[PDB]
Amino acid sequence: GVVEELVAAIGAEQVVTDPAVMEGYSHDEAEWAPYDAPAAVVRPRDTADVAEVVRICAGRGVAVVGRGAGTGLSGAANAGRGWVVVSFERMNRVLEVDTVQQTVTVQPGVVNDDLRARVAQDGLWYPPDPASSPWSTIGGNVATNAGGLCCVKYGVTRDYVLGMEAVVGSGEVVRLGRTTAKGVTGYDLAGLMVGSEGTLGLVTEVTLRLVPLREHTVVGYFDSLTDAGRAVAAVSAAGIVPSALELIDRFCLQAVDEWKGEVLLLARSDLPGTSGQEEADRILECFEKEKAVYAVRSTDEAEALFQARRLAYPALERLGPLLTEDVCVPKARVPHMLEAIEAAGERFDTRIGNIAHAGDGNLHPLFIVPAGDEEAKRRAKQAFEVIVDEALAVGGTVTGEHGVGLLKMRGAADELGPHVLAMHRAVKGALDPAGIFNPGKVFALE
Amino acid sequence: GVVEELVAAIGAEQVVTDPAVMEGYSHDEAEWAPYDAPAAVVRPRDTADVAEVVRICAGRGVAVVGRGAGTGLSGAANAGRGWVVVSFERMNRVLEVDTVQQTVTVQPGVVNDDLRARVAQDGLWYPPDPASSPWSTIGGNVATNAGGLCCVKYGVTRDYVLGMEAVVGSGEVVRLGRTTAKGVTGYDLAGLMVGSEGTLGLVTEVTLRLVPLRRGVEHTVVGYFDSLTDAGRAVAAVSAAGIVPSALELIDRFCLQAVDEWKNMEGEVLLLARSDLQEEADRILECFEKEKAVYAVRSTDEAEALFQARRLAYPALERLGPLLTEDVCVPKARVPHMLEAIEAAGERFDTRIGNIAHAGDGNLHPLFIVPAGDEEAKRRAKQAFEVIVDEALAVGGTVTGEHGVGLLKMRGAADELGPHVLAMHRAVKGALDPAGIFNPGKVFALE
Ligand SMILES: Cc1cc2nc3c(=O)[nH]c(=O)nc-3n(C[C@H](O)[C@H](O)[C@H](O)COP(=O)(O)OP(=O)(O)OC[C@H]3O[C@@H](n4cnc5c(N)ncnc54)[C@H](O)[C@@H]3O)c2cc1C
Ligand SMILES: Cc1cc2nc3c(=O)[nH]c(=O)nc-3n(C[C@H](O)[C@H](O)[C@H](O)COP(=O)(O)OP(=O)(O)OC[C@H]3O[C@@H](n4cnc5c(N)ncnc54)[C@H](O)[C@@H]3O)c2cc1C
Ligand SMILES: [Fe+3]
Ligand SMILES: [Fe+3]
């Protein structure tokens, strides 16, 4: 009967309990991730309301799962029987853009693009652009440490989180991190909150640092995954850093070309003036010493090839359920990793489509399961399970940006090992003594 | 005995007990920071030996304080009576330079420059260049989260720690962080170890990210001023008028004519600037002639000696007596107000405080030199730097920007963090160090 206490705690129009308005709030876009009907879905208005839902929930042992827009692919925001889904959709204001400090102060509910458009008016820029930029929230991007296409040279969300206001413990509002451009005082707790996937506390206000408002595409029509890619084991080994570098295959494109060589490799270079034309002709030398049917300098605003890469996951989702994996391996092991994905596609008769942020060795293998073809659905799980077990042996990690959540919990336990898992339970026990903040995700308590 | 177990595990040429050969291992350069003779100073050879020192001391409640080169300015490496000083001076090798991944894998004892010179051979660059680059270690810079001079565009040491190998708890050797260029698996535990000042475990290996060695545009900008008050509106204007510089420092003549009594190589405020792009290179002048300036030459030649003077400013003064240094960092828009307040606090406590500052990001270094014979001047200066810390907190800054909390800034940091954050600090250290052996009583005070 936690709902009666919540409505007496934070009004009656903040707490929603209708089970029909909850099926959309109890899961993200991760399919086969066990979710259930929660007890209540709270829509807090300010930090005080979150400080009450955490306080009510800490005295009862009721689980609290934060939720932004529910666009995760690992089930990180999925609810359980009796949980409380704190929806930050009402805290969606940008509270400041310090133009001289080059920082912005945002609430966890502001959408990624809504933030980028706002800071653009003041000549500042927020680099991290995850392929879900028009939908994901800053509160979600901070807890998952989401990365984008420009992470090659600009970094992930952690590279811009300066400080934050969180609700931790039994409901204490604390200020974490610095607000300046330098500061070592204490521990790096504001950083520990990044990538924690909401299992240590709810962020109710985030800072973030900005950069001034910083164009050459590269293109390359190639064939197999064994080759083609190998220009990524060469661009990093030979030619500088491309402002972007993706790896999408024709298999995903002719599913975007229906919804309004063989495997391409786009690259970018954003340098003003003559410094900048050479990055676009420096990023070519790697592309023709490797088969190369076409490969044209290009750079003709076309750009149409990068919207296709962004709409790679917005496609193949209305064509059936989509299972996605997200491994990140060393850049020198991308050629074999593409070999293992295509070889795992025949060991389990499943034709795995490949998209990848090739600029840092982060691959997104993806297979589309026919809502009627069963065995390809069950070989793919085993096929996507050998991919993670292979990416771990080459020296990579089970996830590169999407987070652990639920679907990558086992494989992640193998990477961290028994000793690191012991520290995870110890850390969460200190900052979440009641065990209410998204329990059983990333690691399993017990 | 307690030394008997150290000698029984790996104690032949690793364990030293001579009290004369331990004072150089039991304290750093922080003046008036309580240090004392430890019980033993271990100089481990590999990660396994550290796992033995932690295992012995965890079962006995004996404190362990890590040591790199002992160049801290906050007493972060100071030992206590009966502690064990783990000296990483024997782990001073770079064990890898991944050229395709653009990473380096180094041991905690490697000197900061020793790392950059090594990676320079392969056309790669390690940006963070702290003013103690010829002496401090990478293991120390990771534990302190040290920053450099051209950091105002590339970031601090934390911005380059990818993964690490640490000895945590009762002695388990663990791998923290990734080695690739992406990875969110688990918590950012390797990051929690960065900037922890060795109070959660000893780092025995850190992986670091590198950047290509671009050259060409080393446009510098000099320009002596008249006062510290009017070298405000010109540091807050280089950012508001557009685009931050590759570097921007602010040193005064008292430190310059303290370097000139050595390598005999103008005004009262130098303020150097940099630009690595090229336009703008005449635009960072406009902040200097719109405000008062005795001089200002966009000089691209060598001009470059003045930066060795800025770097060697604390390597200077080091010969003029004991030096009390502070390290506050305030918002960039509040540097002008801070420089007025410190110089005004120099007469409210008539101690003439010399000023160096990373004015490009708001990190100020007020410093006073103690005559060492005037006793009250020890207490006149102490309170003068105390109102400076209390002013940086009320203005919206932090008690430390790069030097770390350590010992000398514990009272000020406790006021900034507050009771709730301090409670989380003890809870974390209690969880990862249940025995309380990893540098106890630093950064925060255990109840
Ligand atoms: C088409 C498409 C493309 C995508 N491309 C990318 C990509 O390139 N890179 C990438 O990283 N991701 C991508 N994503 C998914 C991405 O991981 C999520 O969108 C993002 O990580 C967070 O989104 P959210 O906030 O909407 O998620 P949610 O599922 O709502 O939750 C995010 C997590 O944070 C927690 N949480 C939310 N708010 C708070 C708070 N204040 N405090 C603490 N915890 C909180 C939740 O517990 C949850 O674990 C993509 C998704 C889609 C559909
Ligand atoms: C002239 C001068 C200029 C300086 N400039 C800067 C600057 O620009 N920026 C800046 O940040 N600092 C600067 N410093 C001080 C600087 O913090 C230290 O030089 C450096 O951060 C620590 O290096 P170290 O190994 O010498 O530290 P130590 O004196 O050994 O102590 C460092 C701290 O980290 C711990 N530690 C050491 N090794 C390890 C390990 N392997 N694992 C865990 N903990 C460990 C110690 O316990 C101690 O608490 C300067 C100092 C001087 C004298
Ligand atoms: Fe992605
Ligand atoms: Fe400094």
Numbering used by the authors:
A (entry chain A): 3 to 216, 220 to 265, 273 to 313, 316 to 460
B (entry chain B): 3 to 267, 272 to 283, 289 to 313, 316 to 460
Show passages lifted from the paper:
Here, we report the discovery and characterization of a new FAD-dependent D-lactate dehydrogenase (PdG-D-LDH) from the gut microbiome of the isopod Porcellio dilatatus. PdG-D-LDH exhibits a strong catalytic preference toward D-lactate and preferentially reduces quinones over cytochrome c or molecular oxygen. X-ray crystallography revealed a VAO/PCMH-like fold with a solvent-accessible active site that harbors both a FAD cofactor and an Fe(II) ion. PdG-D-LDH exhibits the characteristic VAO/PCMH structural fold.
The crystal structure of the enzyme was solved both in the absence or presence of D-lactate (PdG-D-LDH–lactate), revealing a Cα root-mean-square deviation (RMSD) of 0.46 Å between the two structures. The structure contains a non-covalently bound FAD at the active site. The active site located at the interface of the FAD- and substrate-binding domains is connected to the solvent by a cavity with a volume of 314.6 Å3 and an area of 490.5 Å2. The substrate-binding domain binds an Fe(II) ion coordinated by strictly conserved residues: two histidines (H371, H378) and one glutamate (E415). The iron ion forms a hydrogen bond with the FAD O4 atom. The B-factor values of the substrate-binding domains are higher (36–126 Å2) than those of the other domains (25–85 Å2), indicating greater flexibility, which may play a role in binding substrates, product release, and catalysis. Unlike many other members of the VAO/PCMH family, the FAD cofactor is not covalently attached to the enzyme, as it was released upon chemical treatment with SDS.
